[PDB]
Amino acid sequence: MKLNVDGLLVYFPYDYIYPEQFSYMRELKRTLDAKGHGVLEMPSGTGKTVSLLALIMAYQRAYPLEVTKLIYCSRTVPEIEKVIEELRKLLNFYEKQEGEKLPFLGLALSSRKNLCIHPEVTPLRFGKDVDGKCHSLTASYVRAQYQHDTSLPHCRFYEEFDAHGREVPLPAGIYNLDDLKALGRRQGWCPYFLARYSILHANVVVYSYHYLLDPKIADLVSKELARKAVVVFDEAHNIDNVCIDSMSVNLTRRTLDRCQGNLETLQKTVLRIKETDEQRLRDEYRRLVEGXXXXXXXXXXXXXXXXXXXXXXXXXXXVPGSIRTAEHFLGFLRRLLEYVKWRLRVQHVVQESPPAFLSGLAQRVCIQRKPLRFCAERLRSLLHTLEITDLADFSPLTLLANFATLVSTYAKGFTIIIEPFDDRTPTIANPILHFSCMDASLAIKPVFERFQSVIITSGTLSPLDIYPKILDFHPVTMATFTMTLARVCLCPMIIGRGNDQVAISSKFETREDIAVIRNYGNLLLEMSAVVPDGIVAFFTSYQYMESTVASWYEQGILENIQRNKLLFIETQDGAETSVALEKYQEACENGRGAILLSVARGKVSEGIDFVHHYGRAVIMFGVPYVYTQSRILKARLEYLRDQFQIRENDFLTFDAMRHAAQCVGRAIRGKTDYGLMVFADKRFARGDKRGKLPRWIQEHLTDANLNLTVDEGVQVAKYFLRQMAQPFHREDQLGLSLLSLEQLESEETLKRIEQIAQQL
Amino acid sequence: XXXXXXXXXXXXXXXXXXXXXXXXXXXXXXXXXXXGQVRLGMMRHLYVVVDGSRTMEDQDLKPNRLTCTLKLLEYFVEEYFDQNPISQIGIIVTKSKRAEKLTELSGNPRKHITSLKKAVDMTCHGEPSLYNSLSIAMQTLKHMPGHTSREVLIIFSSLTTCDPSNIYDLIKTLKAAKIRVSVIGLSAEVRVCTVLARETGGTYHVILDESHYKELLTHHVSPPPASSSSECSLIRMGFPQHTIXXXXXXXXXXXXXXXXXXXXXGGYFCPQCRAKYCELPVECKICGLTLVSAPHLARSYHHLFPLDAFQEIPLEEYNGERFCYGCQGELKDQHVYVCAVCQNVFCVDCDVFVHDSLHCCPGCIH
Amino acid sequence: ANKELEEKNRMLQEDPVLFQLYKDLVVSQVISAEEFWANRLXXXXXXXXXXXXXXXXXXXXXXXXXXXXXXXXXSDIIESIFRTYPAVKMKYAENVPHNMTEKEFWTRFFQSHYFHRXXXXXXXXXXXXXXXXXXXXXXXXXXXXXXXXXXXXXXXXXXXXXXXXXXXXXXXXXXXXXXXXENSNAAIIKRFNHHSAMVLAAGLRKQPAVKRAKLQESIEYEDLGXXXXXXXIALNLKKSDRYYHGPTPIXXXXXXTSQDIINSFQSIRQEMEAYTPKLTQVLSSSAASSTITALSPGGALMQXXXXXXXXXXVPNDIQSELKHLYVAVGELLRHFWSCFXXXXXXXXXXXXXXXXXXXXXXXXXXXXXXXXXXXXXXXXXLVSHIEEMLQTAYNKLHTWXXXXXXXX
Ligand code: SF4
Ligand SMILES: [Zn+2]
Ligand SMILES: [Zn+2]
Ligand SMILES: [Zn+2]
């Protein structure tokens, strides 16, 4: 539908919109006029991906100067597939309207799990083993040995892509992972390296977060592309958690024992290759002395492992010290390994700053700072040198070498915390070593430096006052869009009152209180007896879901929940969860009642979305606090007190509410979807915790619904479902919660859309 | 706990009257009726599937749901045989994951209402079974002839739809067997009944009150319009005259009956097989002919040349015809209703009477 | 197999009137037993057209007691366990005498994995629990998620999954820390996952296509597209005057020439001017006396009607005779007019019509024999209605014969 969004025509790929839609489109015109970042909040009602891709395609169709390339970033591979197919719908609409005058290269991109063909690599199930066999079958040196012989191993895909495939760009076709694999089958190529080679020619690229924010993966979108690039994150609550997962490094005693075995293996390899060859070691010493390890770096496609984990602006251009002879570098890694192993021997929890660890190094095993920076460059050049094949075998030592880089680079923001035993362990032999970071800003800092205008957008983000206060961030637009409705469409209730008038809570900190778990089971039973077609029940921790569903069996509850609906409990297997989800979705459609109870942290509620009739009543059990984790929490909170200015009790409440309202706000797809969404404990009524739920849920949280009983909540659920199971046809929306062609041109509608959207 | 503050007062003498009048006016509503000049399914083997679930015993209605549902089905059988005479009804109670053909497909209200008066006394144990109930309704409704709009009405309450097999192959079969299934639902919307209703061709509805549930069953009394799929055949019909004992039984034919009977002297014959039937209309028990007295075709002629809308105007508005053209009375209220063709004057009583019972404008006859 | 015999018998027993009929037709030498039981298919599909699927609490509906180790006789429970756990089915194939009884076998059935939801080395259900674990590992390893096409693929819902090396939350799955109660609670989780999976699979009897299907389903919105309304074929009647004067035959309606309109308007405008005699003009008394003479029971308008002279002489046993006769001739004409109507122009249906002709002629012989054995008692009670029905069967048979011989 041909929108006027105050400067430009926009072909919306549906012949109807919401008003929330056009408010979002106004504010995103605002963010792309002035080159600034902006944080938006469209709730899950609209097609925010639909709108988002529509306006970015409108700018790229209308302005070939300011915006070169869209980099969408959605976090899970099914969301990659969804965003590609909505882009494909919009191109099909775009080509219905005009004809085959498209040229538009949509492109997904994930990994060698999902773009490899070869029938000996394909039956591997893991990412590192697929990377190892792809490093076996092609390299910089195995490819040359095949190039001057015949029977040496090769893929036939990368070789044929090397033969012809690097001169024909992909003509204007929006490609999924499946379509791209099919084109790799067709002419006979690698679609992995085709996708990476065709990053340069695309207009929309849709990959994951860790393919952009990791400094040791994202070396594939250069500066000149980034100066006119628009990056759009999507579902971006845990950006700070992605950063802290993206730069912290964990060392384990098993990692160090396999590092010792690796060190002996590489010592034997240096001995036998010293018996074999000498001339390329002379060339090694040349390209260390002469250059800065870039001699054979021009032809480097599959010879690249994970790069140096320092950021793009803190790397150096000097010569690697005393390291040069590989015998002495094995001695260097030997010293570093034995010192970190001796440091890990301490049988109490020890927190250090990284300069204290560097001084303990530089005093007690004589290793200085700059040869400890260049350890990543040295191990990558050495491991390229000695022709060795299966790099999965060398996963620990590279880890250790990469750990060395971080210890020798960053200070005052990061923290080296040593644990002799974990929290749920105590006194079992797992001494681990978190080089943990707590600057969230030091991983998105080159993302704001390089890129023009990055757009954090999610359905839930609250409060918006804190994402500039964590990410070292100053946006143009800080927008919240109010859910305008012609029908209530949702009701949140805070069931914080047992049927015995017992205060429902989780104050006990996972050590079971009996009557509260009793009232949780009573809530689940009676809400099962009311709600149709699938109830989703998020607990706090898997130990707590474990303990709760344990004491729902010895206590006589869970058979009654069986009598009403079919349970599908969760486990932390990767395949058992998928089978329980599949049976849960085959039981919401074959008549019976299905109820999926999970944990509000894991992968069950990150990508796997619950649409019109899969979850009607999202039961958020408890307030999700990170309670199991170590002094990483205390140290990140001490950091946010000190060098940012964010309180203890402010950040804990913010984190708990972003997880709770993250897991709740998936139930609703459109305006014609209705989701009961209950919150079950009293703490969600206490003003600060309720104050950090998003605006489109606080708008429909009535003071009567605030602190309901179990049975009052059940009767509100019954009245909700009965008032909201009637024919709510399209003719009930054209006034309020929908807009036609000609309902847009009225300036009264423009006054309405001015009144809907607000800023912070 | 403080509803007592709902009573305001401005002058307090007629202001409590205004609050009471606002409440008494907000405690009532009007129906929504639809008109169509479209083909209707007038021979109509409808087949009622009631729950006998555990959720029938819930007390959301003023008696438990079984009793209210069964009372309105007694009213439903009454009005459906009062309005469509050719058609038939069959009643299945669905109980304990199994389905029970409680009253076979017949066309007289005595047996059905007798069986519902019996079925007040039941137990309602177990979970229902939509598979087996649609299987029994399909099994009887395979072999009715193709011009019959074969319809099933599932008054369905519970949520666990405990089938013993796959119920999407039934919906594909019933899609191909051109049956039509409509579900009236209690307390919720269930996805499977929604797919069943939107795919077989029917309509799904959920219940607020007594009055809304009466409106839904009244909506399913009338013959629903046909798809582009149902056969438009020409059923061979028989019109047997009534025959008393000929001339004081001078060479009569003394029979018992044809379905505890006495000695029948005379009555209704059949023009195909020459049997003896007491009551008309009855499908021929030994021939397959359908026997019609033919006001039973005239009892449902109003569906074919239907009514129109009354132009409803409340105000005074030019009325030089002060009296009701219906029954010659004054219009002491502010609602005047004027027809389309003749454009005479009618009041509210004549409105409800013409549009519900007499089914014709008294002006357009003249 | 002697199935049919047992059916026709069971019926005859339960249905003595039908038995009667069966005798009055087969035993009376009119038709043969095989034909009668052959074309009389009217029964149920199965015991309930299916069974009762295991809803849930198949171990906890009337738990461990047909009144722990109480009695075990409930049919729903044993059939639902027979469907639900095929390991218990194979165990019932094995250890059923052959040295245990249902008391001891079901007492060894309320053991773990089945009633207590445990996981330990135990009695005779241990290998059955191991086979159930192998079935779970076959569903997880030899099988996977079928609709992992665009969602629900929980193993690979992360594009870059690594080991526990370079991460933050690497202490997720711990190879250490295996307790007793914790492993029991994980066992309860696994047994309920398997229990609900077996319920859903027992109630369900035995590529870019699926992926684009799930993508196009989860993307779309019901609001922003097309509507949901099927059609309504417009019935615009052509000739509605055929409805206005309906199936009433044309009465003699000949109003004469329109001169009479003017004459009658003149005479009745003159007539209704001078008016109201009330005493004089209304009734002469002789007309009233003749009217009372007429409405008296021997005059005109008293039609000598509502007489209804009946023949109630020997009621009861003749009524029983006529019940037998109308049941029998109803079955005969049932078969006749059921196969008769459409000619069904082939040789099998014509052969069934010839068998119907033979049954018809012998039916007429048996009806004449029954009339001779019945009506020769006290000389009353015309049975000639049954002879009218059978004479019309005779007539349709000869008329069809002449019609098909014209159609030769
Ligand atoms: S080179 Fe291509 S085909 Fe060979 S393993 Fe790598 S991705 Fe697979
Ligand atoms: Zn007949
Ligand atoms: Zn009129
Ligand atoms: Zn009137």
Per-residue 3-state assignment (H helix, E strand, C coil) for A431-450: CEEEEEECCCHHHHHHHHHH
Name the closest residue on chain A to residue B189, using Cα atoms. A725
For ligand 1, atom 2, name the residue with the nearest CA: A190
For ligand 1, atom 5, name the residue with the nearest CA: A134
Q: Are C161 and A77 in contact (CB under 8 A)?
A: no
Q: What is residue A271's three-state secondary structure?
A: helix
What is d(CA B296, CA B58) in angstroms, rounded to the nearest whole number? Answer: 41
Counting Cβ atoms within 10 Å, is residue A232 exposed (0-12), middle (13-18) or buried (19+)?
buried
Q: What angle (nearest 5°) sits at the alpha carbon of residue A184, between those of residues A183 and A190?
A: 150
Question: Is the CB of C218 less than 8 angstroms away from the CB of A111?
Answer: no
The DSSP letter of residue B330 is B
Is the backbone peptide bond immediately before B164 cis, with ω within 30 degrees of 0? no
What is d(CA B217, CA B186) in angstroms, rounded to the nearest whole number? Answer: 13
CB atoms within 10 A of CB A459: 21
Q: Which ligand is nearest to the CA of A120?
A: 1
Q: Which two tokens stand for residue A346?
A: 């301490």
What A245-248 contacts at long range (C-beta under 8 Å, 24+ apart), as own/partner pairs, is A245/C167, A245/C168, A245/C169, A246/A210, A246/A213, A246/A214, A246/A215, A246/A443, A247/A215, A247/A309, A247/A406, A247/A414, A247/A437, A247/A442, A247/A443, A248/A434, A248/A435, A248/A436, A248/A437, A248/C167, A248/C168
Q: Kindly report the nearest CA distance between residue B312 and chain C, in angstroms.
A: 26
Q: How far is the CA of B26 from the centre of ligand 2 (A)?
A: 57
- Tell me the three-class secondary structure of A74-134, residue by residue: CCCHHHHHHHHHHHHHHHHHHHHHCCCCCCCCEEECCCCCCCCCCCCCCCCCCHHHHHHHH
- Residue with structure tokens 């082939």? C346
Q: Which of C243, C341, C392 sits opposite B288 (nearest CB)?
A: C341
Decide the pairing of beta strands A594-599 and A535-539: parallel
Resolution for this PDB entry, in angstroms: 3.7
The DSSP letter of residue C306 is S
Neighbouring chains to C with at least 3 Cβ pairs closer than 8 Å: A, B
Q: Are A69 and A51 in contact (CB under 8 A)?
A: no
Task: Return the closest-CA partner of residue A380 out of A406, A356, A399.
Answer: A399
What is d(CA A664, CA A658) in angstroms, rounded to the nearest whole number? Answer: 10
CB atoms within 10 A of CB B85: 18
User: If you count them, how many residues does chain B have?
Assistant: 366
Q: Which helix (H) or strand (E) holds A758?
A: strand A757-759
Helix C316-340 vs helix C384-406: crossing angle, to nearest 10: 10
Q: Which two tokens stand for residue C83?
A: 């469907």
Q: Which two tokens stand for residue A417?
A: 């915390």
Cβ of B187 under 8 Å from any chain A Cβ?
yes
Q: Are A370 and A318 in contact (CB under 8 A)?
A: yes
Q: Are C49 and B139 in contact (CB under 8 A)?
A: yes
- Residue with structure tokens 């009311």? A530
Q: Which two tokens stand for residue B187?
A: 């307390």
Task: Return the closest-CA partner of residue A181 out of B364, C176, C144, C208.
Answer: C208
Output the CA–CA distances (angstroms, integers) from residue C118 to A171, A439, A519, A563, in the order listed. 60, 47, 25, 21
What is d(CA A455, CA C288) in angstroms, rounded to the nearest whole number? Answer: 107
Q: Which two tokens stand for residue A642?
A: 């000190």
Q: Which two tokens stand for residue A430?
A: 């797992």
Question: Is the CB of C57 less than 8 angstroms away from the CB of A563?
Answer: yes
- Strand ordering across the sheet containing A535-539: A490-494, A675-680, A617-621, A535-539, A594-599, A566-569
What is d(CA C99, CA B331) in angstroms, rounded to the nearest whole number? Answer: 93
Q: Which of C55, C156, C181 sits opposite A113 (nearest CB)?
A: C156
What is d(CA A133, CA C65) in angstroms, rounded to the nearest whole number? Answer: 60
What is the number of alpha carbons within 13 Å of residue B301 lying toward its C-beta? 16
Q: Kindly report the nearest CA distance between residue A741 and chain B, in angstroms.
A: 29
Dump the DSSP string for C258-275. Answer: THHHHHHHHHHHHHTTS-
The DSSP letter of residue B240 is P
β-bridge partners, A42: none
Output the CA–CA distances (angstroms, integers) from residue B111 to A437, B71, B90, in the order listed. 81, 15, 10
User: If you count them, how many residues does chain C have?
Assistant: 408
Q: Please give the backbone phi and psi of residue A106, each rounded to the nearest 5 degrees, phi first.
A: -70, 150
Output the CA–CA distances (angstroms, integers) from residue B295 to A72, A486, B39, B289, B357, in the order listed. 72, 49, 21, 18, 16
Task: Return the closest-CA partner of residue B256 out of B242, B246, B266.
Answer: B266
Question: Is the CB of A15 less than 8 angstroms away from the CB of C161?
Answer: no
The DSSP letter of residue B355 is I
Amino acid identity of residue B274, one-letter, is: R
What is d(CA A45, CA A669) in angstroms, rounded to the nearest whole number? Answer: 6
Q: Please give the backbone phi and psi of residue C24, each rounded to the nearest 5 degrees, phi first.
A: -50, -20
Rg value, chain B, Cα: 25
What is d(CA B18, CA B10) in angstroms, rounded to the nearest whole number? Answer: 10
Q: Are A16 and A739 in contact (CB under 8 A)?
A: yes
Helix A77-97 vs helix C208-219: crossing angle, to nearest 10: 80
What is d(CA A589, CA B167) in angstroms, rounded to the nearest whole number? Answer: 9
Dump the DSSP string for B130-162. Answer: HHHHHHHHHHHSSSS-TTS--EEEEEE--S---
Those residues whose C-beta lies under 8 Å from the C-beta of residue B342, and which sit 6 or more positions away, are B361, B363, B364, B366
Decide the pairing of beta strands B267-268 and B290-291: unpaired
Task: Return the closest-CA partner of residue B168 out of B125, B113, B131.
Answer: B131
No. of H helices and E strands in chain A? 27, 20
What is d(CA B212, CA B31) in angstroms, rounded to the nearest whole number? Answer: 9
Q: Please give the backbone phi and psi of residue A713, each rounded to the nearest 5 degrees, phi first.
A: -70, -35
Residues of A in contact with C200 (CB under 8 A): 566, 583, 586-587, 590, 592
Q: Please give the backbone phi and psi of residue A729, each rounded to the nearest 5 degrees, phi first.
A: -85, 165
Task: Return the closest-CA partner of residue A516 out of A710, A243, A715, A274.
Answer: A710
Structure determined via: cryo-EM
Counting Cβ atoms within 10 Å, is residue A675 exposed (0-12), middle (13-18) or buried (19+)?
buried
- Residues near ion ligand 3 (Cβ under 5 Å): B 339, 341-342, 361, 363-364
What is d(CA A546, CA C351) in angstroms, rounded to the nearest whole number? Answer: 74
Those residues whose C-beta lies under 8 Å from the C-beta of residue C272, and which sit 6 or more positions away, are none
Amino acid identity of residue C336, one-letter, is: F
> Which sign, positive or negative, has the C-alpha torsion C284, C287, C289, C295?
negative
Those residues whose C-beta lies under 8 Å from the C-beta of residue A233, and which sit 6 or more positions away, are A73, A209, A239, A454, A455, A456, A457
Q: Which of A593, A722, A725 sits opposite B159 (nearest CB)?
A: A593
For ligand 1, atom 6, name the residue with the nearest CA: A134
Q: Which two tokens stand for residue A724?
A: 């909201």
Q: Which helix (H) or strand (E) holds B291?
A: strand B290-291
CB atoms within 10 A of CB B319: 13
* Region of residue A628 (phi > 0: left; psi between -120 and 50: alpha; otherwise: beta): alpha
Amino acid identity of residue C406, one-letter, is: X
For ligand 1, atom 7, name the residue with the nearest CA: A116
Q: Which helix (H) or strand (E) holds A576?
A: helix A576-587
Q: Pocket residues for ligand 1 (CB within 6 Å)?
A: A 112, 116-118, 121, 134, 137-138, 155, 157-158, 190, 192
Hey, which of A111, A140, A190, A196 would you mutate to test ligand 1's pocket, going by the most ligand atoms within 8 Å of its Cβ? A190
- Residue with structure tokens 């099919």? A182
What is d(CA A508, CA A249) in angstroms, rounded to the nearest whole number? Answer: 32
CB atoms within 10 A of CB C37: 18
Which atom number of ligand 1 is nearest to the Cα of residue A138? 1
Q: Kindly report the nearest CA distance between residue A728 and chain B, in angstroms.
A: 11
Amino acid identity of residue B253, one-letter, is: X
Neighbouring chains to A with at least 3 Cβ pairs closer than 8 Å: B, C
Task: Return the closest-CA partner of residue A592 out of C404, B69, B166, B204.
Answer: B166
Q: Which two tokens stand for residue B219?
A: 């909506």
Cβ of B235 under 8 Å from any chain A Cβ?
no
What is the number of alpha carbons within 13 Å of residue B28 lying toward its C-beta? 6
Decide the pairing of beta strands A414-419 and A432-437: antiparallel
Question: Is the CB of A178 less than 8 angstroms away from the CB of C177?
Answer: no
Cβ of A363 under 8 Å from any chain B Cβ?
no
Task: Return the closest-CA partner of residue A514 out of A527, A504, A501.
Answer: A504
Q: Please give the backbone phi and psi of residue A248, each rounded to the nearest 5 degrees, phi first.
A: -75, 155
Q: How far is the CA of B285 from the centre of ligand 1 (A)?
A: 77
Q: Kindly report the nearest CA distance between residue B170 and chain A, in angstroms.
A: 12
CB atoms within 10 A of CB C396: 18
Q: What is residue C61's three-state secondary structure?
A: coil
What is d(CA C300, CA C291) in angstroms, rounded to the nearest whole number? Answer: 9
Q: How far is the CA of C245 from the centre of ligand 4 (A)?
A: 29
Q: What is residue A549's three-state secondary structure?
A: helix
Name the closest residue on chain C to residue B94, using Cα atoms. C48
Q: What is residue B46's three-state secondary structure?
A: strand
Is the backbone peptide bond immediately before A78 cis, with ω within 30 degrees of 0? no
Which atom number of ligand 1 is nearest to the Cα of residue A130? 5
Q: Are A676 and A531 in contact (CB under 8 A)?
A: yes
Question: Is the CB of C157 less than 8 angstroms away from the CB of A210?
Answer: no
Q: How far is the CA of A155 from the centre of ligand 1 (A)?
A: 6
Those residues whose C-beta lies under 8 Å from the C-beta of residue A91, and which sit 6 or more positions away, are A102, A104, A106, A174
Q: Kindly report the nearest CA distance between residue B127 and chain C, in angstroms.
A: 8
Counting Cβ atoms within 10 Å, is residue B336 exposed (0-12), middle (13-18) or buried (19+)?
buried
Query: If you count residue pairs, one on B and one on C, with CB atoms under 8 Å apart, how many are there?
Result: 138
- Residue with structure tokens 């054995």? C373
What is d(CA C144, CA A57) in angstroms, rounded to the nearest whole number? Answer: 38
Q: Kindly report the nearest CA distance between residue C321 and chain A, in angstroms.
A: 54
Q: Which ligand is nearest to the CA of A184?
A: 1
Task: Return the closest-CA partner of residue B176 out of B203, B201, B210.
Answer: B201
Q: Are A473 and A659 in contact (CB under 8 A)?
A: no
- Residues near ion ligand 2 (Cβ under 5 Å): B 270, 272-273, 284, 287
> Which sign, positive or negative, has the C-alpha torsion A197, A200, A206, A209?
positive
What C388-396 contacts at long range (C-beta under 8 Å, 24+ apart), as own/partner pairs, is C388/B253, C388/B274, C389/B273, C389/B274, C389/B275, C389/C329, C389/C333, C390/C329, C390/C332, C390/C333, C390/C360, C390/C363, C390/C364, C392/B273, C392/B274, C393/C332, C393/C333, C393/C336, C393/C360, C393/C363, C394/C360, C394/C364, C396/C336, C396/C340
CB atoms within 10 A of CB B260: 3
Output the CA–CA distances (angstroms, integers) from residue B211 to A718, B187, B215, in the order listed. 18, 15, 6
Question: Is the CB of C159 less than 8 angstroms away from the CB of A211?
Answer: yes
Cα A350 to chain centroid distance, Å, stands at 30
What is d(CA A274, CA B35) in angstroms, rounded to the nearest whole number? Answer: 96
